[PDB]
């Protein structure tokens, strides 16, 4: 979870909690979704509630993760709730991949030091030598540019 | 319905889809091709966003004296007749000569008459400056808009001028000797160099991408959530019109029945 | 990879930027007082330009 900052992690999950709640709220104020289960023989004029608070929560938390549930809304007003919710889901994960790719291309690049010539250009970290240890003398006496310039 | 066929329309851009798939053939071809518009776009969306968001970490100008030596967007300079470039010329050293070549080329805006000129110039444009590491303190510790970057590159010292063979020098070095050891010189600097309040300079957000970068999305959700409810009751009232009885008490019991079951 | 490598490329913005890359060849009117500057040029970039 390194790419996103922990603030997103909290803000999103609470958002998913809330958007699940409001959907359940609208589920009660939803005229069409009342659907008289088994209308095959409408003997009884009874409708049973759908989108229970357990279900309404289950959708958004289940839709966030890229599956999509079987409770696609069956009315007008409730359908908009998911559609906007979907757009939130698609962008965040697609953003999640992009970042995590950026990390692994950065690290795959940048070629850690493996030779003295790497230090020839580099100046952030230091050289090191014991003077008069017969090695410093080699650099000062030398005549090859990379050795010459690092002697400086 | 004009609503169903539209639902599957929008419900498909986002990679979910509804359970209203075309059961018929001639209608199906629409779905086959409609999908192909999305999957190319969404996949195009992800990669491209990575392209924007990778070149950003491909470069960072934070370091200096070699990091500054590599890019070219930021312009460099020093002071006219500045002893710094006299050092910085014939540098003979790994990177600074390569830096010196850069400023040697554009030798019309690199040189400035005095320090304040460059201080003006950095205030104007994205212009890094290279000079003595004491006066930089004054502008950064008094103007809360500029800042020193990097560390030490040279170990020069301010002295007092004197002709050859002047008895003053050794006579005055000891004078300077006791003053510094008395920290009297340090106290004298502390009064003119006291500085002012400056920010902590610690702005790390503890992440690569944070709420500032994409937080606008959460706002996008905020709009749709609230506006739906207004229409939700709006069609409820329209439904309360669909039976031609404006009174709401039967609906109030309809609300109550909903709570029970 | 296509989009990201496409983005990171840069043009030859400046003469020193033209000094590093070698495939893009230089050019000047022969003895038209143009490379004659690069004769007595003292700047390394213009010196390596002239070479």
Q: Which residues pair with B209 in a beta bridge?
A: A4
Q: How far apart are CA B38 and CA C42, in angstroms?
A: 59
> How large is the C-alpha radius of gyration of chain A?
32
Method: cryo-EM
Residue ranges of B 49-108 with Cβ closer than 8 A to chain A: 49-50, 53-54, 56-58, 63, 65-67, 92-95
Reference C49, options C41, B4, A4; nearest CA is C41
DSSP of C1-51? -HHHHHHH-----SHHHHHH--SS-----TTSSSHHHHHS--SHHHHHHH-
**CA A145 to each of CA A23, A111, A148, C13, C16: distance values in angstroms, whole numbers, following the listed order:** 72, 23, 5, 28, 21
3-state secondary structure of B52: helix
* Number of neighbours of residue B132 by Cβ within 10 angstroms: 14
Which chain B residues contact residue A72 at CB under 8 A?
11, 18-20
Q: How far apart are CA A147 and CA A139, in angstroms?
A: 6
The position carrying tokens 């230089």 is C26
Resolution in Å equals 3.8
CB contact under 8 A, C17 and B72: yes
* Number of neighbours of residue B147 by Cβ within 10 angstroms: 13
CB contact under 8 A, B232 and A5: no
CB contact under 8 A, B46 and A98: yes
Distance from CA of C29 to the nearest CA of B (A): 22
Which chain A residues contact residue B218 at CB under 8 A?
11, 15, 88
**CA B73 to each of CA B55, B70, B90, B106, B114: distance values in angstroms, whole numbers, following the listed order:** 15, 10, 24, 13, 23
Structure tokens at B41: 């776009």
CB contact under 8 A, B66 and A121: yes
Reference A73, options A61, A87, A62, A59; nearest CA is A59
B89 sits in the region (left: phi over 0; alpha: psi -120 to 50; else beta) called beta
Give, to the nearest 10 degrees, the angle between helix B4-13 and helix B25-55.
30
Reference A25, options A44, A60, A52; nearest CA is A52
Q: How far apart are CA B91 and CA B98, in angstroms?
A: 9
Q: How far apart are CA A54 and CA A58, in angstroms?
A: 6
Structure tokens at B206: 């503890």
Q: Determine the distance from the C-alpha atom of residue B207 to the mean position of all C-alpha atoms in its chain, rounded to a whole number.
A: 13
Q: How far apart are CA A10 and CA B73, in angstroms?
A: 38
* Number of neighbours of residue C44 by Cβ within 10 angstroms: 17
**Chain B residue nearest residue A83, CA to CA:** B11
Q: How far apart are CA B24 and CA B7, in angstroms?
A: 18
B50 touches chain C (CB under 8 A): yes
Answer for the pair B248, A41: CB distance below 8 angstroms, yes or no: no
Q: How far apart are CA A34 and CA B158, in angstroms?
A: 88
CB contact under 8 A, B14 and A87: yes
As to burial, measured by CB atoms within 10 angstroms (0-12 exposed, 13-18 middle, 19+ buried), residue B47 is middle
Answer for the pair B105, B63: CB distance below 8 angstroms, yes or no: no
Comparing CB atoms, the residue among A84, A87, A95 nearest residue B214 is: A95
Q: How far apart are CA B97 and CA C20, in angstroms?
A: 15
Please state the φ and ψ torsions of residue B69, each to the nearest 5 degrees.
-70, -15
CB contact under 8 A, A66 and B206: no
Comparing CB atoms, the residue among B58, B104, B105 nearest residue C8 is: B58
Q: Which letter does DSSP use for residue B73 in this model?
A: S
Answer for the pair A27, A123: CB distance below 8 angstroms, yes or no: no
B62 touches chain C (CB under 8 A): no
> How large is the C-alpha radius of gyration of chain C?
15
**CA B213 to each of CA A3, B179, B209, B219, B232: distance values in angstroms, whole numbers, following the listed order:** 12, 54, 6, 13, 32
Answer for the pair B18, B11: CB distance below 8 angstroms, yes or no: yes
Three-class DSSP labels, A39-76 = CCCCCCCCCCCCCCHHHHHHHHHHHHCCCCCCCCCCCC
Which chain C residues contact residue B58 at CB under 8 A?
8
Distance from CA of B246 to the nearest CA of A (A): 16
Reference B7, options C47, A116, A124, A74; nearest CA is A74
Which chain C residues contact residue B55 at CB under 8 A?
4, 7-8
Question: B111: part of which helix (H) or strand (E)?
Answer: strand B111-112
Q: How far apart are CA C27 and CA C35, in angstroms?
A: 9
């Amino acid at each position: 979870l390194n790419p996103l900052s922990p603030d997103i992690w909290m803000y999103v999950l609470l958002a998913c909690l809330g958007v699940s709640c409001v959907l359940f709220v609208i589920a009660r104020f939803s005229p069409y979704e009342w659907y008289n289960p088994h209308p095959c023989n409408p003997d009884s004029d009874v409708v049973e509630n759908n989108f229970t608070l357990l279900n309404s929560f289950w959708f958004g938390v289940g839709a966030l993760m890229q599956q999509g549930s079987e409770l696609m809304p069956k009315a007008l007003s409730t359908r908009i709730v998911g559609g906007i919710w979907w757009f939130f889901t698609l962008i965040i994960i697609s953003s999640y991949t992009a970042n995590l790719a950026a990390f692994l291309t950065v690290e795959r690049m940048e070629s850690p030091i493996d030779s003295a010539d790497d230090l020839a250009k580099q100046t952030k970290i230091e050289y090191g030598a014991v003077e008069d240890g017969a090695t410093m003398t080699f650099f000062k006496k030398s005549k090859i540019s990379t050795y010459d310039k690092m002697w400086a | 319905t004009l609503l169903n066929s539209f639902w599957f329309g929008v419900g498909a851009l986002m990679q979910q889809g509804s359970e209203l798939m075309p059961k018929a053939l001639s209608t199906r071809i629409v779905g086959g091709i409609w999908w192909f518009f999305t999957l190319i776009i969404i996949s195009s969306y992800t990669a491209n966003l990575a392209a924007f968001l990778t070149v950003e970490r491909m470069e960072s100008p934070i370091d200096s004296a070699d990091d500054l030596a590599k890019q070219t967007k930021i312009e460099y300079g020093a002071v006219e007749d500045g002893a710094t470039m006299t050092f910085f010329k014939k540098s003979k050293i790994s990177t600074y000569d390569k830096m010196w070549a850069f400023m040697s080329s554009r030798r019309q805006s690199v040189l400035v008459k005095s320090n304040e000129e460059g201080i003006q110039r950095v205030l104007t444009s994205d212009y890094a400056f290279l000079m003595e590491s004491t006066t930089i303190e004054f502008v950064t510790q008094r103007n809360c808009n500029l800042t020193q970057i990097g560390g030490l590159i040279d170990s020069k010292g301010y002295g007092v001028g004197t002709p050859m063979g002047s008895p003053y020098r050794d006579k005055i070095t000891i004078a300077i000797l006791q003053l510094q050891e008395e920290g009297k010189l340090h106290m004298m600097k502390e009064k003119w160099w006291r500085g002012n309040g400056c920010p902590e300079e610690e702005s790390k957000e503890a992440s690569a991408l944070g709420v500032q970068n994409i937080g606008g999305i959460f706002i996008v959700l905020a709009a749709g959530l609230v506006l739906s409810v207004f229409v939700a009751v709006g069609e409820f009232l329209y439904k309360s019109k669909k039976n031609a009885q404006l009174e709401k008490r039967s609906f109030c019991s309809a609300m109550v029945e909903e709570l029970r079951m």
